Structures are given as C-alpha cells and as structure tokens.
Design a protein around this ligand. Structure first.
Ligand SMILES: CCCCCCCCCCCCC/C=C\[C@H](O)[C@H](N)CO
Ligand SMILES: CCCCCCCCCCCCC/C=C\[C@H](O)[C@H](N)CO
Ligand SMILES: *C(=O)CCCCCCCCCCCCC
Ligand SMILES: *C(=O)CCCCCCCCCCCCC
Ligand SMILES: *C(=O)CCCCCCCCCCCCC
Lengths: 60, 5, 235, 283, 268, 235, 60, 151, 60, 32, 60, 5, 5
C-alpha cells in the first residue's frame, strides 16, 4: 500500500522520490499530500457573459 | 503493493 | 521489539509539520460536497482581480470614500504630477490595503508583473490625454512629465473605451522582492500626468474623478508564508 | 491538470507595434479585469519562467497550526466556597484573530481538522512542597451530551465521547477530526437568523441573534487534571492549536480591515480608521 | 456584428416580461455559473418540489430610489427584497424551504453632461454590522429585513446609546462596506459599474449560492445587493442634481420544498 | 537502531483510538459462537421497530400506563387538536424516550424519514375518520384542522385495518439535524384531528383510546457518537 | 502479510488506501477492521409467519 | 517584564562556521537548524519549577515582532513555530534554499541605496556591504509556562 | 420617442389581462405583460399584446 | 454483502395515486 | 521508493549496501547523500587562454 | 506478501 | 519499489 511520489528538488548536492503509507482507516487522519491543482482566474476576473478578446474594444 | 505518482 | 534510535526533532511540535494522527470520530458519516459556485484553488487568483486604490490618503480624505477619488480638472496644461506612488505593493500605504496588498502581507517575497487600470468618471463631453508612468528604481523619482516620459509609459486617450491599463513589467535585480519597504529590493515609481489637458464644453462639470485599480499578471507569484501586520489582538 | 507547483508562463519576446489592436484600452464597468501581460504594452524579451505558485495554493496558505484558545485548569482542594478548577470551552476559531482572518478571505469552507494540544504547568504559591506528574483529560462533549459540573462527576467516564488522556511533559497531544458540518460546507458568514418571528407570537418568542445558526455549532472541550490534589497548588494551561487539512474554499471576500468585535461582523467606534496619512503626489 | 449586434444593446426576456437596454457594459454571470434547478445527486428534501416557473421567474420592479450629491449608498437582500412580489412571494411564504437564482438589472440613465459612477455589487452572505457598542449580533429580524425599500449606507458610524430600548438596526458604514472590510476590495465580489458617460445599467445574473442545496428563505438571505457611489453625482454646475435609480429583479430556476400553511412573519 | 522521530500525539491515550495491543492470555482456547437468534448488526435496525409514544405527559398521567393512551370520544365534530407534538425525535419529551429517541441520544446528528402509526382501540362498532398531519417548520404551528390540512397529511378511515401510518418525509434545510432542541434544525409539527367524528351505536363505549407508534424508515441514519443525558451516576 | 484496504474519503484536498500489519499471534490483539456488514431489520420489524405485502391489507 | 529572546538570523555572530563559509564568495544550501535547550535555577530558594515548554517562533521580515512574552503574535497562524519540551531530544527543523538571489552572497561589494545629488546625504545613505536590512528575519523564543515563585 | 437626441429615459409599457383592478401604479402594471423601454438610437419600441382570451373570438 | 458504510437507498420519484393499494392502512396487532 | 546504495567498506570483519527512504515531500528535509562529484582544478590552476603543455616552455 | 480489500 | 546505485 505504499505511495511513491517525486519531490520538486530545489537546491542540489534523476528524480528524487519520497514514500508515504497511510496508517489509519479514516482519510481525515491522513497528512496533506500537497499535490494540488490550479485553475484559471476567469470566474472572478472575466465573469462576463460575452467572452472578452483583449485586443478588441471591450465595448462594442 | 506500490503506487507511483 | 524492532531496534530503534530516537533522532533530534523527537517529540517536538512544529506548527508547520505534516503528519498523520488518530481520528477522534471513527466511521463518521461525512456530508458530501455540493458544487458551490466560486471555488478558489490558489490565493494568486484573488491577486489577479482588479481592486480599487485608496490613492488620496490626505488627513481629511483617508478612511473615507474620498480616498478612492483622484480629482482632475480642466485647468491649463501642466507638467506637474496628478499622483505619485512607490512600487511597494505590500508596504506603500496606498497599495498595502488593496486585495493584492493584503495577500502579499501573508508572504515575505513577491515577484512578477503588475497592472494599473484607470477609469475616467467625468461626463461624456469631457476629453483628455493623460500619461501614465513607471520608472524602475535608481534615479531621481519623477516629478515632471519630462522625466516620467523616459520610463515605461502609456499615453491614454480618453473616449468610449472608458478605462486604460499600464502594465508594470517585472523589472528587478533580485528574483523575488521583499514585502516590506527595502532599498535593495525597491520597485520604483508610478506616476500620472496631464499629456494635453482635460477639455470640457460649456454647461459641463469642470472637475471630475478618475479611479485606479491594481491587479497581478499571470506571471505573478509569492512565497515564504508569514503572519500579517494588518490585524491584531491586543488583550 | 495544471498543478500548484508548475512553473508560470514564459515571457515571449515581442517587438514594435502600430495597429488597431488596442489591449491597453478597456472598460472596467463590465466587471472584468483586463487580462494583460507586459508584451501587450511594452517590448519584451524571451524569458524562461521558473517560478511557481506552490506556496499560495489554498492548502499551503492554510497548512499551519494556529492557537485558537487557552484553557486554564488547576489541581486544588475543592472547599465549600470554591471547587477544583476544570475548564470548559465552546469550540470555535473566533476567540483569537489570526486564523479567523485567514479563513474569512472566503465565505465557505470544507476541511479536516487537526487539533494539537500544548500543555504547561506551574506552581503558584511559595511553598517548597511538591507535585507529582499530572495527567490531563481532554473530553470532547458534542451538542447534547451532559456537560461536567464537577471535576470528578460521572460524565468524565466518557463511554461514548472521545477523550484524550494526556501525560505531562510528553509530546503535545494530537487528534484529527473529519469534516463534521451539518451543511455541505462550513459557513464563515450566515446572513440570517435561526428563527422566523411570527406575528401571532410574542417578539421575545420569535427572537434570535443576527447571523447565528446552530447555538452550539460544534460542542465543547472540557479539560481537567485527573490527579487528586496536592498540598501545593499547581496551575496549568492547555493551548489549543487548529490546522485545517484537506481544505477547499468558496466565494472570496475582502479581508477584515478593522479590529474584530465579537463573533459577528460588528465593529467598534474608535477602531474604524485603518489607513494612515499619505499625500497624493508623495512617493 | 455586421448585422448591427452590440455589447451595449440587449434584450432580456423572462416570463411575460422584457427589458431592453441600449447602453449596457455587457452583463455579468456570477462566478461563471448560470442558475440551475437542484440536481438529484445534490438533492436533500425528498418531497416533490414546487417549481412555479413563469409565475415567479419574471421581472419584478422595486420602488425607485433617488441618487443625489449626498447619497452614501443603498442595500437590499435576496430573497428579502422580493418577499412581497406576486406569486414568488406567495410560493416563498407557503413553503419551509426554497432556493432561487436571480437576474438583477439596475437602471440609471442621465445625459452626456452628467457624471458619476455607481459600483453595483452582489455579495453572497452579505452580513452587515450593527449599531451597538455594548452588544454584538443584535440587529433584529425586522430591521435586518427591510423588504423592497432596502436600507442605506452611511459615511459615519454612530452607536446606539439607548440601552433601555435599543434601535437594533444595522449601522453600515460605506468605506467599510457595512461589514468591517474595505470597499475598494468589494470588486472581488461579482459586480458591474454604472459610469454615466459609459453605461446606464448593470446586469448581474446570480446563481443560488449557499452551503446547502436548499434552505429557509424566510430565515436566511443568500445574496446582498450593495450599490455605492464610487464617484459622486455631478451635473453642469447644479448644486443639487438628482437622478433616479431603479431595480428590476427576476427569480430564476426557483423551487420550493415543505409545503404547509402560509408564514405570517412579524415585520414591524 | 532504525532512526525514528517521535511525532505529536506520542504517548497519549485517545479513548476512540484503534490500535493493536499485547494479549494477556496467549493461546487461550476460545469458546466458539453458536447461532443465537436475534443477532443485531446496526443500531438503526432497532430504530426501525415501532415503539409506543408516551403522548399524554400530563402531571397526573406521566410515569404511569396512562401516558400511552390518547383519549378520543364521540363528541360532535371539532377542528381542535386531539394532540400536538414537535418533530424533535431526540428531545421532545414524548419522543425522546421511545427506542428511536433513546438511540438518537447517543448521537449528535440525525437524518431521514420517519413514520407514525396509530392504533384504534375502541370497539368494532365504533367508526370514525381522523386527520394526521405533518407541517414542516417555519409557520404558525397548526392548531386548527384548516392549517394542518395544508401540510403533509393522511386522512384515516377507521375500520378492519385497525391501524394507519403517516410518513414524515425527510424535509430539511440541513443534511443532518441536531439531536437537541435547536431552531436552525427544527423539524416542524405533528398533529392529529377529527375529520368527521367518532360515532358509536347504543350499548357501546363512547370513549376510547388510540395508541401511537414511531419508527425510522430505511433512509434513516445517525452520526457523531456521544454520551446520553438519559442516565447518570451521581456519586 | 500486509493488508491493504481503501478508505471512504470524506473531504478531498483515484482510491486512497491504508495499510495494516498484524504484529501478534492472538486475534484478540488485533485492532478492529470496521469493515462490517449490514442486515435487513425483518427479524425484528416483520417477524410474522406469513410474508407481508405492504400494499395489501395486513389482515385478510 | 518576563524575559523572552529575539535574534536576527545570521552566521556572523560566532566565528567558526563564518570562517569556513567565507573560503567562498557565494553559496547555495538547505539549512538544518538544531536547538539545544538548557535550564537552571538562579536563586537559593529550595522552591521548585515544573517542566518547561519553549516556543521558538520564526518571524520572517515583515511579520509582527513580539513586544511581550504573551502578546497576540505568539498565536502563529502563519509563521512556523516549534514547541519544544524540556529534557526531550534537541529540536530540529530544515529550511530550503530561501535566498532572494540565485545564491547566498557571503560578500556584497556595494550599497542598498544610490545617493542622489538632488537628495540630502542623509537620505541617500546606507551601510557599505549591506544588502537587505533584515536578510532572513528573526527567531523569537519564550517559555510558554506561566511563572513560578522561583526563578 | 420624439424628444431631442440629448434626451434619455426608461419607460415601462404594460399589458394587464382582464379580471383585476386596472393598473394605476407601476407596482401593479409590472406584474403583467410588459416591456421596459430604454430610449436611445433605436428610436422606437414595441410591446406585443399576446392573444390571451377566454373565448375563441372577442366581440368588436 | 451490504456493508455498514454503503449509502442508503435512493428516493425514487413518485406521482399521484388512486387505487386499491393501501400501504397506509395496516394492523400493529400482528406484531409487525 | 527505497534507495539502495553501496558503502565504501573500510575495515573488514561482496558489496555491502545501505538503504534510504525519504519520509518527506520537501527535498530540503532529506539527509545528504554524500554521493558527490569531483572536478578538475583547471579553472583555478590553469585559467590561461592558450592550453599549457607542461613539457614545453610556458613562454614561447 | 499483500492482501487487497 | 527500489532504486540501486
Ligand atoms: C478529543 C478532541 C475532539 C475534538 C473534536 C472537535 C469536533 C468539532 C469540530 C468543529 C468544527 C469547527 C469548524 C469551524 C467553524 C465553522 O467553520 C464556522 N463557524 C461555521 O460553520
Ligand atoms: C522554526 C524555525 C524556522 C527557522 C527559519 C530560518 C529561515 C531563514 C534561513 C536563513 C538563511 C541564512 C543564510 C545565511 C546567510 C547569508 O548566506 C549571507 N549573509 C548572505 O545572503
Ligand atoms: C502496502 O503498504 C504494502 C507494503 C507494506 C510495506 C510495509 C508497511 C510498513 C508498516 C506499516 C504498518 C501498518 C500501519 C497501520
Ligand atoms: C507480510 O507482512 C510481508 C511483508 C512484510 C512487510 C514489513 C513488515 C513490517 C515490520 C513488521 C514486524 C513484525 C511485527 C511482529
Ligand atoms: C518504496 O518506498 C516502496 C517500498 C515501501 C517500503 C516500506 C516503507 C517504510 C515506512 C515508510 C513510511 C513512510 C514515511 C512517510
């Protein structure tokens, strides 16, 4: 049940990895993976009904 | 056994 | 038992650690998520939204609605600044309380390009050309159009497209700047000038406001998490 | 598939321009922010961007334990006008301010809760008399379960409530809690009441606090020194640290700008001037 | 479009109602989510919902307010502002539970010689601050819920000192967005600006937003509409200009659960 | 030894933990199970069994057999309630001590549909139609048939099928309700009325009892285990 | 001898698993798996000799 | 007041590691910090103390520095803190390469400000060879326990 | 609209099918079939009175 | 094979009725 | 995720090995491998533009 | 070796 | 699984 993932290596001395094993039945007991996703800001930065083309006049 | 991400 | 040897760090509590720990409510029936609108995945998404700058923090205008209003008028052309601001997004008092500024105060280092957008709020009959400037650090801060012209700038023609944006490109010696006032990691100078002048016809207000907004570009990032100075709890 | 630790976009080299394309002109009335990048308004060089947004992911932004309360207990002989001190605390993140402000950048959240307990003791009176090592019981009393009236009453049996028996001087105690909300997310703000005032009812009878939903949202922690008392007095404090693991957040908000004044969004006279003096044309 | 279509000229039609505009600045869909009915996978009350469709999902026009040089701002809550609006209000008070999205259309025209700018903000859970410095969280239901008249912002915090009979109302200070956070940051909420030289309206399409799939509409407001003068009204050289502001709002995809006798709230 | 580092939580005793531990009686010859009738696998099975409601907790009737008996009579039709009860299964005094109520007091949260079954215990010659109501929360609690009719209800015709069931469907704002009296998670109102009236011939008792029962439906669940207030140990 | 099972993941940050190894000879020493079964209430709720059809008259 | 300590992180307060690092002009490395903690009684009274817990808070440049052993900053919602228990193994944490440059400069032949002619000398002045004033921030340490009768 | 180009305005044109109090205030008229007319370059605005009748033909 | 952590049954949509099927009428004397 | 490397065995009593597993996501948390490389001193000892042949006159 | 439930 | 240097 071991999970093997790669570290993003910052200062250096191939891919360096690290190992994780969950010891408990409840996912709440688990540490945070920090393997998170990003998304585009659009729902907050461009919430307009008609798609904005930045080279175009915003008002037409 | 092992998962590899 | 398996032979083991306790290493340094044993029994400490680091508030930043990431360990497993026993669940106090085993087999609890968790309520599922629902698709609530507006999910955020990274604080920099909020940094990319335009929020309005409290430019005029004069003794009478600060902590009032007036601090957001930059007054222009139709006076004859001058080469004197409408406004002057330091590119210190987390510490200059006019920027530090914007949403960008606020998020930056939870981090020690910032980097990347920024953008300032100005909104003209005079009447339709009002016309004008302004010069928006960014002078990277190291020389005399611009106080006359003459100097500000020599740096990064946008000449804004007022008309149907109500607003105009000047991008402050990431131009720095260091790979990240500090989120405090620091001479080594200073960012330089934002300023706005009259290019021609505001002209109005008769029967028209001769004075008006412009509003300004700041937001981060897509190449903008922060690092080294820290507590802010923008909230406290005395007693 | 873009991850939090991926590098941000490269700056692409760009040259002079003279066209009808107007990136710089825009209109904020629409409610949108102009998506510009430096090559839209200046000449750029090609840069290979290595920087990432890894440390500002929602998880990384919150991945710290924060103090949310300090509980005081003692181990003294109970005597007719004063009993041995045990502590009772209504679980909340709103008794302190720093974690509260971070959570309140958002309207709603989901997370697993990690609670760490730091325990410290001291002698309060001059006598050279000693105490032996204390064991502490931290009992979680969920809404509805009987709250202890005495340091030694029947409720400390805990047949069903979770308790931690912590030994003094050992590693700080730690437990995890799942997302336990009765809604699909935790509400950092609830613009409403828990009761509708009816006309056919008295005002008193239809009344409730603005912005409060369940009265005892999450229950109580009750803490006691399990040891019997010493001749000498020892006082202890239990500092509680909360970390939100495995967190999701919705609907961003402007951060708290004036001092907190209670569990709601209320503010106090005299605290309403966060901004300092600075002249418009002064750098 | 070469057949005339413009970002500034729109027609909106819901039920037996149409809005036209010739000076829009596009329209906003909050958080990019259009209103929807509650899906089976997210459902919670099991009884057959009531969905009034065109009977309630239509444009209702509230009482027109007046913008002047001394205006500090106005606020409304949803669904509260619509509680007495035709069959929407009826359906709301007959059921324990209700959910709804909205098209909010703020209207304010003037002339090419007037100037001024209104920030129109839709805030999820728009909790406002109270008037007391001896008590917190004490704004009464009646004062929290003005119905269609809405409330207003003030430039000054002024604490209620009558401790015998407390006012129990909000004291929402404009530069603090009525909630202790700075107004300049309200732009992270879904918004538009009515800048009189540019546009004469704002249109916000709001999804149902909540930490629940459905809730008590009578106990809880999901959205707040805050309108504040970002740049003050001005005209020619008149000392006392005035222009009207009208709100027209339509419920969208509303459904109700838990039918019983009608709720008769204590509103005064 | 293997290098190890002690983490927070080390040496604590969480009463809810789930760890292995050494056996004090190694190689003990355990007695095998036998197939004893009545095995239970989940407490909600017990919640699904009908148990009888102590409806009439008047000062003289409470803590006596009488508390279970709801008295009806052949009086002329009225629109006034035979009984009124709050849907607070763990805390309303008439429900809290039923088997359902009891199990709910070991948990903090409940959810799902319930059902009330009434048993007519008058003579065969007695006839009648009753109205059993459930009004979800938020309005004036029903005190007249007029209001109760507008909510969820069953009109019960008395006859050979002795009993009648009204299902209280899960209708809630929250995904789980609290097992205490709480306005935010209130459940609403159960009430019973005369639809026509009880009619008897001559030589027949004019008064009789109905009995009521509550049980959980198959969609019913509880969570967050807790100690009950229904037992104590003073000294 | 490792046993690998899945967690029912409640709040989220594929199947997440956890590992278990028994360290003792006596099953009494083992932790509880919590991998339990459910059953129908019938032996208590419908203990009647003739199967009940709920749409039908219970007495016939 | 009750004594808490504040230290500006540096390798230049002692001499041996400094001399080794200074065989070179620039460096990159991950930092391992180990903390050895020792206590003693200072006055004659036979009165005792109970086991102390220490809080080592890292305050990065910009975060509020504690003015009192018990003020709000010790909440640490975002700053990393170590709660160390007396008599246990010495505490230890690691830090990545956190420099704002591509390498740490052991020597910086320059100033953090250019003195301009149109500016006063005072206004253009800065220390020779110093770059960021608070290069790496502060460690603030306190005894978390309330006080004993004995010191 | 026959005012000058400089004149602006928004009007509400209403149709209330029969059977209630004839509208005398915007409040009532809003609740029926209506068009909110924004005055501008498109000089004119149309409100369609849809056929809404009990009988198949009305009397003249 | 149904486990303790399996979800409970879905509510199935259901419409109006007018029949000889009488779920609501019953008889607790049976013991069920 | 185990990493197996060889020890350079000094005093003796085949290749003896040792095992390493990274327990953390951040490479900064890792121990030092000591598996380091060497390089030629030339950039400091022979920094001249024209390659030096040691048997030849250094000046020609 | 390994069991997988 | 295993790396071997
Ligand atoms: C033995 C120790 C057990 C400790 C158990 C604690 C269980 C209770 C968890 C409480 C969850 C609190 C969440 C934070 C607050 C809420 O987000 C908001 N005020 C709104 O719901
Ligand atoms: C809870 C403990 C956290 C401790 C965090 C310490 C973070 C700061 C690391 C400081 C890096 C110092 C590096 C050494 C000095 C510099 O090389 C030179 N003076 C030039 O840059
Ligand atoms: C998957 O995990 C199969 C491999 C097992 C590797 C060794 C596990 C190390 C000890 C874990 C003990 C179990 C914790 C409850
Ligand atoms: C099955 O268990 C084969 C794999 C062994 C994995 C490593 C075991 C971890 C240490 C267990 C020690 C024995 C406990 C008595
Ligand atoms: C690669 O690592 C697969 C083999 C796993 C071997 C056993 C791991 C020993 C325990 C490591 C625990 C995880 C540390 C966070």
């Amino acid at each position: 049940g071991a999970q093997v993932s790669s570290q993003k290596v910052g200062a250096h001395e191939s891919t360096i990895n690290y190992t994780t094993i969950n010891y408990y039945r409840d996912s709440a007991s688990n540490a945070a993976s920090k393997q998170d996703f990003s998304q585009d800001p659009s729902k907050f930065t461009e919430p307009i009904k008609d798609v904005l083309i930045k080279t175009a006049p915003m008002l037409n | 056994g092992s998962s590899s991400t | 038992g398996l032979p083991v040897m306790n290493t340094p760090g044993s029994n400490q509590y680091l508030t930043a650690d990431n360990f497993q720990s026993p669940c106090a409510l085993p087999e609890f029936d968790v309520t599922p998520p629902i698709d609530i609108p507006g999910e955020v995945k990274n604080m920099m998404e909020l940094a990319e939204i335009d929020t309005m700058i409290p430019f005029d923090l004069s003794a009478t205008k600060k902590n009032t609605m007036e601090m957001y209003r930059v007054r222009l008028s139709d006076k004859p052309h001058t080469d004197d600044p409408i406004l002057c601001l330091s590119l210190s997004p987390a510490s200059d008092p006019r920027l530090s309380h914007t949403m960008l500024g606020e998020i930056l105060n939870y981090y020690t280092h910032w980097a990347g390009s920024l953008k300032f957008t100005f909104l003209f709020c005079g009447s339709m009959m009002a016309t004008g050309k302004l010069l928006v400037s960014y002078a990277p650090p190291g020389a005399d801060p611009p106080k006359k159009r003459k100097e500000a012209m020599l740096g990064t700038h946008v000449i804004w023609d007022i008309g149907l497209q109500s607003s105009c944006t000047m991008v402050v490109p990431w131009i720095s010696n260091t790979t990240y700047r500090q989120t405090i006032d620091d001479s080594f990691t200073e960012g330089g100078y934002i300023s706005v000038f009259y290019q021609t002048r505001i002209v109005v016809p008769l029967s028209t207000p001769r004075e008006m406001d412009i509003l300004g907004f700041v937001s981060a570009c897509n190449d903008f990032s922060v690092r080294l998490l820290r507590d802010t100075t923008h909230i406290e709890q005395k007693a | 598939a873009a991850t939090s630790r991926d590098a941000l976009p490269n700056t692409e080299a760009s040259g002079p321009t003279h066209s009808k394309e107007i990136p710089a002109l825009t209109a904020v009335e629409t409610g949108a922010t102009n998506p510009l990048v430096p090559s839209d308004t200046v000449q750029t060089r090609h840069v290979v961007q290595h920087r990432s947004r890894s440390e500002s992911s929602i998880e990384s932004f919150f991945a710290r334990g924060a103090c949310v309360t300090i509980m005081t207990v003692d181990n003294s002989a109970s005597t007719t006008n004063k009993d041995k001190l045990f502590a009772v605390w209504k679980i909340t993140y709103k008794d302190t301010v720093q974690l509260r402000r971070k959570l309140e950048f958002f309207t709603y959240s989901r997370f697993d809760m990690e609670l760490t307990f730091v325990v410290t003791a001291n002698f309060t009176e001059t006598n050279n008399g000693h105490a032996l090592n204390q064991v502490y019981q931290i009992m979680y009393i969920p809404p509805g379960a009987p709250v202890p009236e005495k340091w030694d009453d029947y409720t400390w049996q805990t047949s069903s409530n979770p308790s931690i028996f912590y030994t003094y001087g050992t590693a700080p105690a730690r437990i995890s809690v799942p997302y336990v909300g009765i809604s699909n997310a935790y509400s950092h703000f609830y613009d409403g009441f828990s009761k509708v005032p009816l006309k056919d009812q008295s005002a008193a009878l239809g009344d409730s606090l603005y912005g409060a939903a369940s009265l005892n949202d999450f229950g109580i922690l009750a803490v006691r020194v399990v040891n019997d008392h010493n001749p000498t007095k020892v006082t202890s404090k239990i500092r509680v640290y909360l970390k939100p693991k495995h967190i999701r957040v919705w609907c961003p908000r402007p951060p708290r700008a004036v001092a907190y004044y209670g569990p709601g969004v209320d503010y106090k006279d005299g605290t309403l001037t966060p901004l300092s003096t600075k002249d418009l044309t002064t750098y | 479009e070469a057949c005339g279509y413009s970002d500034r000229v729109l027609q909106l039609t819901l039920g037996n109602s149409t809005i036209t505009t010739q000076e829009a600045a596009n329209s906003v869909v909050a958080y990019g989510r259009w209103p929807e009915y509650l899906r089976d996978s997210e459902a919670n009350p099991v009884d057959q919902p009531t969905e009034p469709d065109v009977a309630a999902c239509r444009f209702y026009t509230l009482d027109t307010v007046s913008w002047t040089k001394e205006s500090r701002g106005w606020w409304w809550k949803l669904p509260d502002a619509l509680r007495d609006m035709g069959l929407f209000g009826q359906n709301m008070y007959y059921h324990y539970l209700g959910r709804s999205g909205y098209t909010v259309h703020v209207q304010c025209n003037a002339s090419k010689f007037h100037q001024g700018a209104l920030g129109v903000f839709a805030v999820p859970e728009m909790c406002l601050a109270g008037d007391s410095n001896t008590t917190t969280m004490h704004t009464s239901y009646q004062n929290a819920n003005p119905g269609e008249k809405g409330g207003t912002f003030t430039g000054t915090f002024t604490p209620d000192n009558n401790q015998t009979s407390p006012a129990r109302r909000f004291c929402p200070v404009d530069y603090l967005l009525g909630n202790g956070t700075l107004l300049g940051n309200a732009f992270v909420f879904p918004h538009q600006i009515i800048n009189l030289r540019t546009n004469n309206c704002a249109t916000l399409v709001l999804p149902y937003v909540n930490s629940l799939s459905i809730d008590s509409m009578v106990k809880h407001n999901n959205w707040g509409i805050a309108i504040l003068p970002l740049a003050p009204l001005n005209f020619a050289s008149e000392s006392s200009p005035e222009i009207p502001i009208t709100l027209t709002i339509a419920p969208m995809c509303c459904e109700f659960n838990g039918l019983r006798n009608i709720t008769l709230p204590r509103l005064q």
